[PDB]
Amino acid sequence: DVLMTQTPLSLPVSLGDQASISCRSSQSIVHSNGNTYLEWYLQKPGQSPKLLIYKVSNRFSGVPDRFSGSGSGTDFTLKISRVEAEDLGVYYCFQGSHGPWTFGGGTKLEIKRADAAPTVSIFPPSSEQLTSGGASVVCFLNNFYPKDINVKWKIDGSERQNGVLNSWTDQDSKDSTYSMSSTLTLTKDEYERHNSYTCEATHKTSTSPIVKSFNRNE
Amino acid sequence: QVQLQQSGAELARPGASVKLSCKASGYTFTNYGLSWVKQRTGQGLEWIGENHPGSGIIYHNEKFRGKATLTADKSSSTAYVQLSSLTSEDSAVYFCARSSGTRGFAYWGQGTLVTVSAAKTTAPSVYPLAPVCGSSVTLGCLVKGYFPEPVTLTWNSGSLSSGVHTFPAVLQSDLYTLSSSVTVTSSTWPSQSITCNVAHPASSTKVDKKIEPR
Ligand SMILES: NC(=O)[C@@H]1CCCN1
């Protein structure tokens, strides 16, 4: 099978800047009929893939002229001029020349924006959940950049390392930020045996952790 | 108006099969190829196979020998893929795509999520996330302990969307948990109701949670 290797794997690029994506094939991808079926596709977060370019460098109708392709032999390049937020997602090359047809592994395009501190919010368990014997404390770390961040939980001042469940969004093109949810779950019984619950977010935008907390007796 | 409309999410069992549908409209079904493309969670794309509904020709991928059979009903302009001998790692989103010799995969269906698991369908619990003492206010909903994906979550029936963050579901044991936050002007809430609306098609569950202050 034709191996299609994309570099870089991850591509942070500022708004308005140019980006280039390389797609190398383990072998030639000229079909017997003379055509080179090298195509480029963009998959935005949570969407179906979109055709950008076919036969190496023909732009598909409806695709902005900012996308263009080149290459020959075993190295093909997608260029993005004047990157826009809507361009973020994963770019795939694809060969439809030799069986089986194969995609590249994909290139993650990230919008590189100004650093943004997380907006941190904390939420106690609902009474409804307590009824089932479990108790979830939720922390939102919203609209931060870059994606690198850590969340830590503390109960009555001491670090709690079990019961934690974390979820990370993909980058939001609305403002090129990331968000993250952390849920700390324990038994209702243990939840009621403590007073203070704290989540702490550590991010490059602050020398000190960002702290949000509540007391059950507040 | 070219459209490829795919069937809804599936829960398939290990060792079993599932048939996916892809109904074409807005063009002549039998004038183009039709490919299926698979995509695993946090993984890239993979071509499964192609059939030409006009001629009945099938382009095969040996990697899917005994795992995929492609058919088509010319009458209803609908393409099918039968995925068999399923295992857990066949869990993926499956797309259909109109496939032309001039341009390639120019049009794609919206994708069908296929979960392969022996776990039972479980309805979600939906819990309100009411803020505590701490210019804008952020509220949320916690959607806990459901299976399989997907759920849909909206705020005030879709009216609020600009301040919303919905997070990807995380699987723990055989149950998913998801959360969603909504940020609004401190003047809006609580002097204005904010409600998260959750649907879990697999269990025909709908749940509303009005966010009330503590
Ligand atoms: N034989 C080939 O190279 C291609 C692959 C699928 C059909 N034609």
Numbering used by the authors:
A (entry chain B): 1 to 218
B (entry chain A): 1 to 134, 139 to 218
Extract from the study:
MUC1, a type 1 single-pass transmembrane mucin glycoprotein highly expressed widely in adenocarcinomas including pancreatic cancer, modulates cell–cell interactions by altering the O-glycosylation profiles in its tandem repeating domain (TRD) composed of 20 amino acid residues.
Notably, the side chain of Asn35 in the CDR L1 forms a hydrogen bond with the O-9 position of the Neu5Ac residue of the ST antigen.
